[PDB]
Every structure is written in structure tokens, then in C-alpha cells.
Design a protein around this ligand. Structure first.
Ligand SMILES: Nc1ncnc2c1ncn2[C@@H]1O[C@H](CSCC[C@H](N)C(=O)O)[C@@H](O)[C@H]1O
Ligand SMILES: Nc1ncnc2c1ncn2[C@@H]1O[C@H](CSCC[C@H](N)C(=O)O)[C@@H](O)[C@H]1O
Lengths: 236, 231
């Protein structure tokens, strides 16, 4: 047989049917499910086996989360640990792994559909365009929410001319365009996708100079900003 | 009818989305981009489905085959490796389908850099270390890169790099990055993530020793460090 394992699973961008097959099958097979708040679609939780311990981690500290996993480990019970999107980017999986290694609790990771992919799909767009863009930068702004390492400034990324997929930043929409106009041009295409794949999904396309900045301060913060020529060109 | 562009995922049959599998099961016609789309997914095609490998085909022939399905009112499952947003050549197909008024939609998939990070058990962004991931490639005698998109310019940011389509020029990648990232900078290469013959190498830029081409290069401190903050 196999021993108790914590299965980190990328739940995808919000639609229950955008989890992987593997992701859903692991949910179906774990007696304990820990899900990272309402950004994990509740319909996924219907896959938990009958009698599962289902735990919303959004009100919990990292310590409480780790203690709960340690309890599952002590009981020999597999855990389905669900995070929105994919695990590789801004998931806070890393800090959990470090704690699990220190406790010798085994884990594995099942990749998900990241939100920039959901957003591109919503737009019906290939981001890479021969002769226009051959790179995509996944980034964020400090946005009064983080320190960025020194070299990770919008200015330094903007200098490459790559497609930018800017996360965690819709509340600072106005600063973003101010910092990007000098590099990309006033007329550079920009697209914002709120809540990609949710019943709630909303899109705005414009150029940097013509984007309605006040859209950012609105209630919904789950939005991805895409910037670059390849968002609105057929010249490729 | 509708042409369903679908991100097949990194290769394992179970790393397609539920939606993607369901769309495949409901399409009388399936167009798949080569053996980089695992054959097990083709088992999901409905009985008597016309299944077509597009790898041997020109864009004109692909669009013809689609226009045929459209004239026959038959939905098309159009499979590409990984996700569609990056180096899929989905774009040129949509440009042609628009010019013909053929309806399409896009189902996102798991990109290979995500599958690679997952096999490594790694979160790429780590507070106080790296808050950005650059998905890129090299010219590598296979492309022209826009002028701003050099390894040099990217390396200047100190971001994590997920370098695609570049394993044939690993030597030159290493030499360009060392000056910026350091000789001791952790690096990992994942060949064929999620496939049965998946191979993983973890090293540093200096100690990585320079033939499958389906490989992803990942570079950065966050690949092997526990000195980071909570979020
Ligand atoms: N369904 C969705 N639609 C649009 N943007 C989304 C989204 N889900 C997450 N995001 C973006 O991701 C940020 C949260 S950080 C978590 C990102 C997630 N791990 C991923 O793989 O994408 C949000 O601020 C927003 O910029
Ligand atoms: N299973 C896999 N393992 C490692 N790298 C892979 C892979 N599948 C694709 N790649 C990478 O992607 C390149 C092909 S370009 C297609 C990328 C795909 N659309 C995606 O979403 O990732 C290859 O050169 C390789 O770098």
C-alpha cells in the first residue's frame, strides 16, 4: 500500500470543470479536504467522498493549517489541499511545503490551469505572436501589498517589450498605465479580465491611454491585466 | 457548429481539464497537433469519430479540413499541447476561421511550466526572493526574437525564467545567465513532464553538465531555498 500523502491541487480559474481529471480524482479519494476559500468553486467539494472532513482554510493561520494537516498525518488520512488556479505562482504553497518537510509529512503536487491562461482563453487569444511577442511576463505590482525584489519593476519588464500578465494589481490600475505608457505607447492594446471562467466573468479591451482607470477601484479584485501589441493585431 | 480549441495539457491523459475531456467526447471530428498530444486522449473521441493528426499538414490543409466540418455541421475538437496562450500557433488558425465566419471557442489547459514546477514540488514565487516568472525562449536558429526580448534583458530583472524551445542550446543559455544569476544559481531541467519517460535534472548554472527536445529550463534561487517570508 501507499502511505498518507498531502496532495496539493491546482483547482483552476474558477469553473468546476477547469480542474484536471487527476485533480478531481484525488479530491474523490481523500478523506480530508482543505480548500483555500471561496475562490475554490464549491461544486468541486461535491466530489469529496462521503463522510469527508471538509475544511475552509481562509479563516485559518498557517499554524492552524499545518496542525490540521499534521492531525491527518497522525491519523493516516490523505489530504486534498486545494488552491485557486495553479500552484506555481502566488499560491502560498511554498511556505506550507517548508513546514511539511520539517515534520516529515509527504506531499505531491498536481498542476492546474493558471489564471493568465483562463484570461487568454476568455479573450480567444494566443499571447505569443511571431514578429511581435515571443515572451510572457507573469508579474505583479507592489500595490501596497508586497515588496518586489529590486529588479522586478514594471519599468524593467516594460523595457523588454514582452506581453505582461499583471496579477494582484487591479486596484492600482491608474499607476500601472502611468508606468507603462512611456514604454509601450499610448495606443498599446490592453485587456482586463475579471473573474475569468466564473458566471461572473467580465472583459474590457482598450489601449493604455483609453482604458477606464476607475474600473479598478470597483469591488472585484480577481482580475488579470494583459498588456502588449499581440493582444490586438493581425499583423503577424 | 463550433471549433473547440483545447489545451491538452503537458502529456498525461489525466492532466486535461474535465471540460476538455467532455468536449473531446462530444466532437465528431478531432484534430490533434501531433504525438505531443497523448494518444489516450483520442480514446475519448466518440465512436466513428474522424481523428486527424495535423503535424503532417499545412495551415491551408488544416483550415480546409475545418471548413469541411463546418459545411457538415460537425463540431471540432482541436487539441494542442499544454495551454493555447503560448507557442501553440492557435492564433494563425483563429485569424483564418474569423475570415470564414467559422465559430470557435477556447478551453484553457495546464501549461508545461506549471507541470514542470509541480514535478519539482515547487512554488516559483517566494516572498522576498522572486515575485515574477518570465515565460520565454531563445532565438536558437528557429526564430527571430523581438529586440527587447533577450536573455540579458530578462536576467537583469532577476525573475524566475522558464525557458522553452531552447534545450538544444543549453550551453549558450548557461553562459548568458551566469554573469547575472551567479555560478551557484539553482537551475532545473524537466524533460517530458508528466510523460512516462519524464526526466528531471537539478543543478546550478556552473555544475549543470551540457537527445529529447521536449524540455523546460527553470532558473532561479526560489527553486532551492527556504529563506523566504510568509504571505
Ligand atoms: N478567475 C480569475 N480571473 C482573472 N484573474 C484571476 C482569476 N483568478 C486569479 N486571478 C489573478 O490571480 C491573482 C491572485 S494570485 C493567485 C494566482 C493563481 N495561483 C494562478 O495560478 O493564477 C488575482 O489578483 C488575479 O490577478
Ligand atoms: N511535457 C513537457 N515537459 C517539458 N517541457 C515541455 C512539455 N511540453 C512542452 N514543453 C515545452 O514547451 C515547448 C513547446 S512550445 C508549446 C508550449 C505549450 N503551449 C505550453 O503551454 O507549455 C518545448 O520546447 C518545451 O520547452
Amino acid at each position: 500500500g501507499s502511505h498518507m500523502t498531502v496532495h496539493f491541487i491546482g483547482a483552476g480559474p474558477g469553473a468546476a470543470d477547469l480542474i484536471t481529471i487527476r485533480g478531481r480524482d484525488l479530491i474523490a479519494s481523500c478523506p480530508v479536504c482543505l480548500y483555500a476559500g471561496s475562490l475554490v468553486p464549491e461544486a468541486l467539494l461535491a466530489h469529496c467522498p462521503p463522510g469527508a472532513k471538509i475544511v475552509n482554510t481562509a479563516p485559518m493561520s498557517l499554524d492552524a493549517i499545518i496542525d490540521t494537516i499534521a492531525e491527518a498525518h497522525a491519523a493516516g488520512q490523505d489530504v486534498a489541499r486545494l488552491h485557486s488556479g495553479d500552484l506555481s505562482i502566488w499560491s502560498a504553497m511554498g511556505e506550507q511545503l517548508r513546514r511539511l518537510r520539517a515534520l516529515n509529512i509527504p506531499y505531491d503536487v498536481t498542476p492546474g490551469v493558471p489564471s493568465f491562461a483562463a484570461a487568454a482563453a476568455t479573450l480567444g487569444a494566443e499571447l505569443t505572436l511571431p514578429g511581435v511577442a515571443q515572451s510572457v511576463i507573469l508579474t505583479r505590482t507592489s500595490g501596497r501589498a508586497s515588496a518586489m525584489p529590486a529588479g522586478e519593476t514594471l519599468e524593467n519588464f516594460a523595457r523588454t517589450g514582452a506581453v505582461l500578465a499583471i496579477h494582484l494589481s487591479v486596484h492600482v490600475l491608474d499607476e500601472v498605465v502611468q508606468k507603462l505608457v512611456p514604454h509601450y505607447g499610448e495606443d498599446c492594446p490592453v485587456a482586463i479580465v475579471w473573474r475569468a471562467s466564473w458566471p461572473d466573468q467580465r472583459v474590457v479591451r482598450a489601449t493604455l491611454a483609453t482604458l477606464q482607470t476607475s474600473l479598478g477601484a470597483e469591488l472585484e479584485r480577481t482580475a488579470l491585466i494583459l498588456v502588449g501589441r499581440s493582444l490586438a493585431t493581425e499583423d503577424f
